[PDB]
Design a protein around this nucleic acid. Structure first.
Lengths: 107, 96, 79, 94, 92, 108, 79, 96
DNA sequence: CGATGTATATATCTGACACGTGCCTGGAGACTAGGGAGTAATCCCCTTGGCGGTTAAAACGCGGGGGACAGCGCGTACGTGCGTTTAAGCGGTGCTAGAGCTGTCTACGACCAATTGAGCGGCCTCGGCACCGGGATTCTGAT
DNA sequence: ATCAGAATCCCGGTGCCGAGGCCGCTCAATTGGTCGTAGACAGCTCTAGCACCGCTTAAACGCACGTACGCGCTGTCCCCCGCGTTTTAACCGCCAAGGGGATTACTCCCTAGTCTCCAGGCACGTGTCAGATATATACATCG
């Protein structure tokens, strides 16, 4: 007689039911257990928040208020765990970190 | 008036690592892709985004190769990168 | 002869982004050859995807997929 | 021609982390592909960990083990903590 | 029972060098090689089906995967073999 | 009911079309599998097997032995300029290496 | 202490197989260091598979799967 | 007394060990080192007899590969001896 | 000490972001059927344990000359700066190939069943290999 | 150059434990078959890609020139390679024994399947304030 969302049950922002559907239609297995999409949503939300916090701090260092891809590059290439997770990836518009080798700078 | 060697190359390095525009020209690359592709199939057609995605991949790959090349160059105690530095880097990376 | 459109200045600036302080005069033609090989190894895959779809127009998803299978995943033009 | 995307939920999380800050549509596209990529990695290794044991389902354990295999060590602890916190809330709310 | 490809490799060996036997150490390597290339080809064939919104893997998907995974001359002869096999099987 | 004639013997193959079709369906690759997939795949797997064994037997003959052993498979795979590309990351137990000395190391 | 069970002549023999004619004496502790970082990685993955199975013995398949995941596939031990 | 020149035997060692296919590290000490590392991630582990052979084959193949790369780095440096810097360059270009 | 680089402040303005609206197709609430996984009990094999001995290999010392690498020299290769010239980028007019959607229907492959012979595990063996040893030739290098 | 003599080579014999043949046998492939469908084809139609036009001035090009850098010859000393005697724990093999991998028969509670209906979020309309752009100009840096 009333409807309340599974993500608001879980206390998550990301959609549980969409992940559950995408799993079942991805053929990854012939069964999906009821707890998996909650766990997976929590993991993805955690990693999203971890990226966005660093991007926000990079934006504040520029005193900008709009996040743009350069700030995501500055986030990913400055956390030793994120960089190890995201090594085989190129980010469009992202550029590189300012990183002259020590032998090149003058005496 | 004249600046000495390397002092403006240093300004170029600091600039282009600060800047983030694409550095290869669009039109010449756009034709080069058509010239290469027509040997696989004539009368192809291209979405305007597919050329930009190619140009992004090509610039990023070359920049990474020049990084490894510069390390090979300092190991020989040079500062000039050499063709053999490219060849060595490509061999150790395992693509040659 | 469109490969002459990758000019020497366009090469130097990419070497600057890679950190190279001093550039030898023989590097450019090797760099062009390397790029030609990379382009052929990506376009052949793109065109194979275009043909299996029976499309006559290449789509940017094809370039993304050519890179992804080849390991060099690209974020931004698709997902 | 409707497209699904995550473009609500990234904005919601951004409002929780920094309610002053906006995001460009390009960076939203990047985030969308980042989510699709890590999703496909985890779902892949979970399916492998099922078939190695000749099992048929994916449970929370396969996700947890995939999470520990793929993520570096400091991420892995905190992720597994809040995965189990989320699941305990779900199974107690019921 | 651990089903294996060993009898089929042995039949193939006895058509290229009829004097030669093969040790169990080399046979286990071949048995792993078959499983590896099978998994790779079925992988890419699945992706090609999914991207075009098709439900089905046909001979076109296997051909296209073969042209993507193998080097060029191997791809040519693999396609020539599969084409001859499927043509003669259709003629049956 | 006709007397059976295994699909391998219609295709003219030794590899097991039945088993490879089963493994295509059971492996969760896609929700439907057509009759042209397993014959093509089994034919290509036969081709690559015969390709490797034809080179390996030549090394075995040069070793003046009647048996193929892993050293000979390593000699085959690493000598062919294209099989080395397909199996470039793979390492073979007990296989060793190709004889390889840089010209600068040897005496004048 | 068991790190010193990998003796100096064993390192010499491996460098000889890979074609190394002359070796500076500092290499040995570095090699013991590099080998240790390699072993730590593989064993960590192996145990992770062993635990999900609720086994107490490490099996050869755990090592084969770990090495495949790391991307340096081993042929010879089943799988 | 008889004495070969320096390196006359070193080449003979190369020619001898590239021809063969045996394992070269002592089995018992290597197994003890494996059991010493595994004790960190769990206690009272056991190892099947083949698992340690799989580990030894993997580790010896890895080190031979690193040594060939080190030798190419040393030759590029205009040297015959391998030194630690050649490992440290090899691992960075490989991305380790 | 001369004088060119990027940084910072005030203002315009125009469109990308951020919001509001309709609505429809994706999700949730509830009941159902039946089989994938959890369980208790077992077997037995292959793993961990101890011991002897000899003898391969590792360890510790010696000799010394060939390597690593620190130094001076040098001539040319490429960074810097300028005037010439050319075509990439822009705004726009124009069309129509083909990409994307709706409709029809029928070729085909998912899933069942009765049937049976192709492929695996086992014992046996006999001969190819390996282990063994002896004599001839190559090659390093001492004089 | 050459020949003293060390290691590689090659030729020969012994005997064993692995590959290969036959054997039982059973379970995974075959054939005959229906039927739900989605995908092969037909038709439409409206996006955005290719073609062509004039304008702009930013970029590319060829050249001069100056000195910083890579390549070369030289030295030396110290540390590694080849050789010797000692000694220690590896390697082989025999005898114990019991933990835990791997298999099984019972059971259940978990998930896929189904109809619903209603509201979440995805097209489509809007407008304003964050930014780029422009102008202005300050002081940091470098030979």
């Amino acid at each position: 007689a009333k409807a309340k969302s599974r993500s608001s049950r879980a206390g998550l922002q990301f959609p549980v039911g969409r992940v559950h559907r995408l799993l079942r239609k991805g053929h990854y297995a012939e069964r999906v257990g009821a707890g998996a999409p909650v766990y997976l949503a929590a993991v993805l939300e955690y990693l999203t928040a971890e990226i966005l916090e660093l991007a926000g701090n990079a934006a504040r260092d520029n005193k900008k208020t709009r996040i743009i891809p350069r700030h995501l590059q500055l986030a990913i290439r400055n956390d030793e765990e994120l960089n190890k997770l995201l090594g085989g990836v190129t980010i469009a518009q992202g550029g590189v970190l300012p990183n002259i080798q020590a032998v090149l700078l003058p005496k | 008036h004249r600046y000495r060697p390397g002092t403006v190359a240093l300004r170029e390095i600091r600039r282009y690592q600060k800047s983030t525009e694409l550095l290869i020209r669009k039109l010449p690359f756009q034709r080069l892709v058509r010239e290469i592709a027509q040997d696989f199939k004539t009368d192809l057609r291209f979405q305007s985004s597919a050329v930009m995605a190619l140009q992004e991949a090509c610039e990023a790959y070359l920049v990474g190769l020049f990084e490894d090349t510069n390390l090979c160059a300092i190991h020989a105690k040079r500062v000039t990168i050499m063709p053999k530095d490219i060849q060595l880097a490509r061999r150790i990376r395992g693509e040659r | 002869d469109n490969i002459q459109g990758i000019t020497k200045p366009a090469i130097r600036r990419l070497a600057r982004r890679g950190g190279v302080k001093r550039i030898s005069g023989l590097i450019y033609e090797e760099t062009r050859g390397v790029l030609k090989v990379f382009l052929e190894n990506v376009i052949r895959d793109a065109v194979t995807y275009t043909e299996h779809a029976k499309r006559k127009t290449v789509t940017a998803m094809d370039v993304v997929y050519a890179l992804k299978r080849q390991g060099r995943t690209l974020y931004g033009f698709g997902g | 021609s409707r497209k699904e995307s995550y473009s609500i939920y990234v904005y919601k999380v951004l409002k929780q982390v920094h309610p002053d800050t906006g995001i460009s549509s390009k960076a939203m596209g990047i985030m969308n592909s980042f989510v699709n990529d890590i999703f496909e990695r985890i779902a892949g290794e979970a399916s492998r960990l099922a078939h190695y044991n000749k099992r048929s389902t994916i449970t929370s354990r396969e996700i947890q083990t995939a999470v520990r295999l793929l993520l570096p060590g400091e991420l892995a602890k905190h992720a597994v903590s809040e995965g189990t916190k989320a699941v305990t809330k779900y199974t107690s709310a019921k």
